[model samples]
Target: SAIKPDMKIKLRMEGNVNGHHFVIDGDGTGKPFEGKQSMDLEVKEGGPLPFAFDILTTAFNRVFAKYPDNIQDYFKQSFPKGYSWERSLTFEDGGICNARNDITMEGDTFYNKVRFYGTNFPANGPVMQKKTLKWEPSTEKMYVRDGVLTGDVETALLLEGNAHYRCDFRTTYKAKEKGVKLPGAHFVDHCIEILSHDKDYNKVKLYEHAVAHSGL
Candidate 1:
């Protein structure tokens, strides 16, 4: 059994160097996120704050790749000795990166530009055809969307099964009873990509759970 969908999982990234200290935390949401997050940055003393910032951001961008996007986004910093940098992000075929690491610098500061490949690896499946499906609370009334399961419950969205080819069907109590057993979950069986979520849905929890269940 994995962490419950409703359960919150916090994540953090922080460090200290010389006279500077910083901490980046995504308070318990189980998912890996990127882009501009509302993390906390502190400079106990400006002496090493600049170096601390770069390390904090660069390290985070590099490490979070194992989780998901958002964290891979650039982390800009304001240094006491002003600096300039250029960066780019690209995803290669099969959704992986094949670029070399590049770095540049200016004045009293420099850049540690990092690039990465996407994680869209191949899917092994007994089902020949597949397509992304919609999963939302409203679908509960008609759990079948394009011949796939679209229930209102977390288990339905998280359950694994072969999706229909242009065919959709609602779920039943039997399916619910079967639920998502951790030891035997598989993504190809699910037959759908979770491309949508309810306004109030915990997206991090959903995606993290899906990746863990399907290994995709």
Candidate 2:
């Protein structure tokens, strides 16, 4: 009744289309604590992101007590100072778009946006389109801001909704020093390979040939 469920979430990616994984919750209210790991998010954003694309039809009209008061008050005013949003985007004759959210790592991340939709699909095959990524997370490592996506970050696409469009990127977040030696560790996952779609010929990951193939 005060935050539970194996906790510690908030995934990141950029190599498929726009992955998903936002479950970091712990500020359940105990007060007097400052360790820094206060995550929160009711949930919703597996697909659809034409920049607030009706918040995926209002979290599926009401997918169980859906809390979407205009994108949760624009995600509670867009992160007051705590941040962690990933990104990937390309455009200029190539034409590509990937967004990430979590504002106040200094302006624009769509002013703080994160909406990747597709909760196992059904009822309408495409209620939330599919793979809509837009991240921006800044706890520190400031290079630049203004709609985020500061470089690589696995290419941005940890989206694991939409019929498993597949995701398993692990090479972003920078935190080594002290003696340096860490290529993984943050819940260390990186397996679940399989999520491809044609959508009439868009050329998505197409299964990436089952990434690790044998338990990573």
lDDT of 1 by residue, 42-159 (tens): 2232322232021122222111112233211111212222112222212121222122223222332222333222123224311111222333221112123343332221222111
lDDT, residue 27, candidate 2: 16
Give me the runs in candidate 2 sitting further than 4 Å from their true place: 1-5, 8-81, 90-95, 103-189, 192-216
Candidate 2 structure quality by residue, lDDT tens digits, 1-216:
222222232322221122333321111111111111222222222332222221121111000111222222111222234333443333211323333444222221112234333233332222234343322221111122342212222222323353322111211222111322222111111111223323321222211010111122
Regions of model 1 farther than 4 Å from truth:
5-7, 11-14, 23-25, 28-48, 52-54, 58-216
Query: Going through the candidates in order, what is the number of backbone clashes in each?
Result: 16, 32
| CA displacement after TM-score superposition, residue 54 of candidate 1 (Å) | 4.8
CA RMSD for every model?
21.0, 15.7
